[PDB]
Assembly symmetry: C5
Homo-oligomer: 302 residues x 5
């Protein structure tokens, strides 16, 4: 008596629908609509998302608002701090608050550093902070008399997010960057610390499916009655410096991500793709002209 | 007594059946035909494709119809667009609309670029777009005098499909390729953005099996009662520059990939292999003279 | 629910297998137990949990399946100078196999050298070899050859050595494009050369459900053909190693079950059989050093 | 069958965690809902589907679990010159931990150089160091030192730094055989240095069946000991990163269920505890930048 | 459906294990609880969910299993000059094992260097060694040795060092084809050298269904032999490390269950045992630094 009902669905795009480079920000959404009912009224069903493919989409790599970076210059002779300046990303950011290239994250940190040294260090001893495309690691390029005279300072947010450099803590907030070579690099990639993207989610405002329990909407009370609809949640990881992506999800062996279907009598519902950031700020996945999206669902009877 | 019924099948080929280099384009198809009935009438069954092997077949690597590429050249001194041309693939394409080598995709982009430099730029400083066999990444080769004078422009389709270059957006369509060295290469492979092949499916016109639910045929309306018989969905990924492949599948992941058998009394049925492109255009998997195809089905009783 | 486990092993020696396995003794075990294995009141499924074929020999190539031909194309006259079949007969064992991809490379080389005996000077004769390091075939050439001529591969050579760069001239032959002294394959193609498809465990006398097979006949489609298979392991040739240690362990998503039809037995045979891509089955044979391990599960329903 | 999902998060900041996580705030969450979570008619299993410990600091070394000693052996006189315990006192935090293998190397070195200063000249004093790039420890020496002397490692040093080649002179000490100026480990041994074994989710108040534990008594065997564990993540230190982002997802082992004993509840606590290899348990703590995510599944039966 | 989890650990030290594990104390634990573990009215399966054997020492080679012989062949005379069997006696520990592939290389090298003593000049003696970096054995030779002579491997050597290029002259012996100074294996063959087959958890007194085993005596094939195995871990030697840290974690949907026959018990013993390819059984033993972890599941039906 076990029944398997498979529902495929797709989304084509174009320049008229999405605008140049996805300027219109059209959310990825699909209206499933059929002439008859999908499920039998005698049976109880579970819903699982078997697969999806988000082919040719754009995702942000950095979100300055979440971070509070600061750089500084220390002196060896006087043994005191020369200055401290916050990293200003304002010129590099798009309207929605995001950046799309770790070269630009590296550039912004460099301009803050070069600007801080303007009065106090000579031109050819100004250290350069940059992002290497090959190794996916940030590097610090320095002269030998700079290393003898001064140190570069990172505050705790810079310390943590660029953790694979070598550090020597001077106080509660600031740390010195230990530099022995002309070109010093990270021991390891830390791009996972910089990406704002946490999860990608499929939701539905009208599908009669059992909600997931959530914590309190407010920041105050532990007590909560809050719920939400989630059909699958895919954990996103940023392996490299590619803002343009092609994301394949295929359910594996265990396939534990089931949700109860509450009402059998329906022929219509909406599905949407939503991106959650690490700060829990929600925003929709948007189409490019060249985006194709595939989706496969399974309604399984019990 | 739960029952496992296993069904094996193979296709050998030759030069008479398939034609030279598979000229005849005979679809991969099998008629399973047996003496007595395959299943018991007293039981209900699920069908799952345990394993297949597409041994020595050919697959296309690129499909120019779906892409609208344009290159261009931007002068720094005048600070204006000098020329723009569409990339023409007509001289590289086979009967069905496909190409079979990423070198040729590189060459086509190169000749477009050379043709656009014909009148305006001197012969020694003409840039060379190419495909590196060793790294699976496309490269742009340039002289120092060219980089001081001019830029290479990619439109939004080029931008997306060759995204791992460093870009600088000048306009709603075109973006500048930032070049700092003689030979500049992609920071990541983008062959996944070029392959027209999405899925490879096994289907049947006469097996009494439950249909999967499909989206609307008509462009205007969203409603649909469209259906189709799909026995398995193999997702394809282009790993390298190999048109000739040996494709193995074993069901270690898709525990859920079952289909209901509606009738128990059948004696014979057809199976055929079909390739779906990303534009959802259907075309059959075809034989070479050297093709061997293996296939294993499971009828599992409930 | 009942889980009944059954271990078996085959130690080998020079007296049982002969020197270099010259006796060709099939890998085979007779299980024989004092009482009945399964209790008569229950119904059972059989599954093969693991085996280990430790220290055995497998072939890497089988010339009979392939029809290789090489040729020389003159670029000046713009015509074919000659064509010859690749003969593997000096390289093959009694059973029809070869055991090293160096030898497969050597045989293609000697065919290519022989065809250039009268036509081209000694110094420009091209060399086709197998690299042990990269598992890729290579073509060594002089610059004088590359201007004058091209090497030709027929379609079987084209498909099996597909990762070279090719240019078709007619419906059978293709030109090998060569721009450097030492040109090599873009990717390994050993998967195209191995004859080994599957390794299987079968039984003459175990009361188990048979798998449905296609027709033995050359012409007709209709079939009542069947056969006993307890597991089938897909084999892939990763490198140039004829000697192998093959480990199989069942992953969690467990489908490879077979119905036991009769509970009343205390004795059965198991045999290991190799299947090739041309469907020709032959037995897995013992070496003196071979150890074989096996674990079966009888799981009740 | 019913699937009840429950998500939770912990945002953090400078005021909650303190500078560099100095306040040592345990990673903990109180769930609290207006209505009851589970239907009283049904029976449930609990499984932790996923968590993500994003931006946390973990120790890389814990001196109290080791007893390291270096020494010097003279080749000519063929006797032990001296021996000393490696002093980690200066390099350690309040809680007894270190966070960099560069500092583990430095501590071993200063003990080695302190033992040499009266009996070996400056030029020939060997340098023990950690290599950031290869993730392997190294010993830098002069040819004059190699011929005159040997470095001595005791058993604990011998085992934790096992990829150097060794020569046992007595039942405790071993000679480090050195041929080049810079000699390195044949393999990384960071897995032997980490104190972190498991990371666990526990709950004092959730009505879930306990896991059976052995006695806290070292001498006696008998035990009635128990504890609430909802999942246990095995941790592996691969590199020199104290700052981590740890992701768990139940693809591997969905056998990890615990019986819910009481359906009637709307409140419980979840905490993240770290267990070292000596079984010393301690709380996972927050940095200002930490974000923690958590997903539980109550599944009916 | 009930899930009963039982944890267990062994925290070693110098006094329990002895210096370098001198005391050869087997890895064994006694579970002993106040009340009965399982419910009397229910029926149970047992699965081992995970273990961790952290800081143990395993052997890499076992000479008694192999009969290695090298030889030398003259090109000019076209005959065998000499043959000698490879003696490992001077390298082997009390229990018949060796712990470094360098020493296996050295032992073959001395057997080779003793055979050349009277026959070949000092410079032209070939060197057999193990390359630590590549995990491959190597042969170093001079130009005039390759022109003058060949090295011979017998069939046992041929099979265990199969990655070299070979050429057979006789039912037992084969020639090692050497074209360059330093010649190496085309593939690693440490898997042909490890004597370790699997690591097993046993129990004398746990009331659990035994696994069915073959005959102890090789005379007859009939057998009523049985043995208690709770889990069965296949071991693979991937490098030259004798000191290891072995982690086992079960797959989501494993079949590796055993039937518990009696629910009325509160005590049992677990022990870790190593099985070799010759089926010889020996206990896993503690070092002072060893930590053992273990998690059982009893799952009701």
């Amino acid at each position: 008596m076990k029944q398997y009902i498979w529902l495929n669905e797709t989304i084509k795009s174009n320049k008229q629908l999405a605008g140049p480079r996805g300027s219109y920000k059209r959310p990825v959404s699909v209206d499933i609509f059929r002439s008859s009912t999908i499920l039998d009224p005698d049976k109880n069903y579970l819903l699982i998302v078997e697969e999806f493919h988000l082919h040719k989409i754009r995702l942000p790599l950095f979100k300055p608002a979440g971070h509070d970076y600061q750089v500084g210059i220390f002196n060896r002779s006087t043994d005191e701090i020369m200055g401290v300046r916050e990293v200003d990303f304002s010129t590099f950011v798009d309207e929605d608050g995001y950046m799309y290239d770790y070269v630009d994250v590296g550039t912004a940190i460099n301009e803050t550093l070069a600007g801080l040294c303007d009065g106090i260090i000579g031109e050819e001893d100004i250290p350069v902070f940059s992002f290497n495309k090959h190794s996916k690691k940030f590097e610090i390029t320095t002269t030998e008399n700079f290393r003898n005279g001064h140190f570069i300072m990172f505050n705790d947010d810079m310390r943590v997010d660029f953790n694979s450099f070598e550090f020597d803590d001077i106080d509660e907030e600031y740390s010195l960057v230990i530099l022995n070579e002309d070109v010093e690099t990270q021991d390891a990639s830390t791009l996972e610390f910089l990406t704002p993207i946490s999860h990608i989610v499929i939701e539905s405002n009208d599908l009669p499916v059992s909600y997931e329990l959530l914590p309190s909407i407010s920041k105050n009370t532990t007590i909560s009655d809050n719920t939400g609809v989630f059909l699958t949640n895919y954990k996103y990881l940023q392996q490299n410096n590619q803002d343009y992506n092609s994301i394949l999800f295929r359910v594996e062996n265990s396939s534990n991500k089931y949700h109860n279907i509450l009402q059998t009598n329906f022929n219509r519902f909406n599905l949407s793709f939503t991106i959650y950031d690490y700060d829990n700020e929600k925003h929709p996945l948007t189409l490019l002209p060249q985006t194709v999206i595939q989706l496969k669902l399974l309604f399984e009877s019990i």
